[PDB]
Write a protein that binds this ligand. Structure first.
Ligand SMILES: O=C(O)CCP(=O)(O)O
Lengths: 249, 249
């Protein structure tokens, strides 16, 4: 017995009106018969189009980032802005952002807290590098990530949180990650939550696999005990995302 | 005589749907009797609502930032995405991006270069901080900034560039630079431009003032030989933006 799965599509910084419109269309067609939460996370610029055009009852929209308050932050987009706009979902603290845009754990932690406080469903990202992994530092890092986030949350706040574990060590590196390696990590996050936050929170918590997933492997990855869905990059700009959703039962 | 002035609104990370509709209705209501190019830079999230609703022939819509190419940059927007969406103007290198989000002169220069390659009209922000001004270093700072941009740009490119001079210490503080401070700063930029690029280019270039511009101060700032207009933060969220516009006459 698992919680409700989530098939999240992180379109990242990609797409055109034309190409996206098409994909939206493929999606609304999809017959999904089980309890799953489909999430399409578009660029800020594509939100409106996606909003109007996505009609499927299992699909909800997410933004790929946000700052906490409004004000003088040229080029940024805030939680109030998003909330007014009718977005209740958010990806926070992705790998690409921690790398290229200076997202310390504490910045992420703060963002998650702000979001949770504004009523969003947060897909908060954690995950270690090839360097970190290699040097025997996996658990230390992942637990620190989750702990930093954990601090600012009250127990009741966990209902608003989804964790996506990203194997950074396996992305762009050459390395392969097996379903047992996903699961090793997944189970260690849940361990942590169970232990510090509580078994009841633990049981309900969605831990999405945030690494390389496609139509071929998603069923297998899904087979694992602590894999509750996916945060999809590549395969999300594609028709196979539909197999990704199916693979969640 | 002078080049065609610009009056740009930098809404920054601010706004509500209804609030912006309102300004836009006002803006559409306004009869701009003189040749001025009016710009509205709204958040990414509102580019749709701005583009669809903003009717006035003297107004363009602009983005507050972008990255050069599309790819795996979760949270970010690229030039190609903006170009696709019918946005042809961009504000780049803003003080708040340089400060908070580590945008170096290198980064700005690269962004600008790419933006002009892709056929955008670019408002490039340059300006010293309080510390530098008090240290006597303003000259060095502004030139280094302008020269960085210059490196990446060949002659013709200049046609699509607009230079915004915004002293950090005047950004939403109340400390509007005097007309004398602005005019000496603006002249310096132009004397560097004529020297390095060409006199032909220097007379064509627009150089804008930004930092604590309101309806009151605007007319005098504008009277200075080398002041081609304004980049307005705060007063752009108000009906006084209109006053600032009429000030470029
Ligand atoms: O930084 C800007 O672009 C304008 C700052 P102000 O709000 O003082 O006009």
């Amino acid at each position: 017995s698992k919680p409700q799965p989530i098939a999240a599509a992180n379109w990242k910084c990609n797409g055109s009106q034309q190409s996206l419109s098409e994909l939206i269309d493929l999606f609304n067609s999809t017959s999904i018969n089980h309890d799953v939460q489909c999430v399409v996370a578009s660029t800020f610029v594509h939100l409106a189009m996606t909003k109007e055009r996505l009609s499927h009852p299992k699909f909800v929209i997410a933004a790929q980032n946000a700052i906490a308050k409004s004000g003088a932050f040229t080029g940024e987009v805030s939680l109030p802005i998003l909330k007014d706009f009718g977005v209740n979902w958010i990806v926070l603290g992705h790998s690409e952002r921690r790398a290229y845009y200076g997202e310390t754990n504490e910045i992420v932690a703060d963002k998650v807290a702000a979001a949770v406080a504004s009523g969003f469903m947060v897909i908060a990202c954690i995950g270690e590098t090839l360097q970190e992994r290699e040097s025997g530092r996996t658990a230390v890092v992942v637990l620190t990530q989750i702990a930093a986030i954990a601090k600012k949350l009250k127990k009741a706040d966990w209902a608003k949180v989804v964790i996506a574990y990203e194997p950074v060590w396996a992305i762009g590196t050459g390395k392969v990650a097996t379903p047992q390696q996903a699961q090793e990590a997944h189970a260690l996050i849940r361990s942590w939550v169970s232990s510090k936050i509580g078994a009841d929170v633990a049981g309900e918590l969605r831990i999405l696999y945030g690494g390389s997933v496609n139509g071929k492997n998603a069923r297998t990855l899904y087979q694992q005990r602590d894999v509750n869905g996916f945060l999809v990059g590549g395969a999300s700009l594609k028709p196979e995302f539909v197999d990704i959703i199916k693979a969640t039962q």
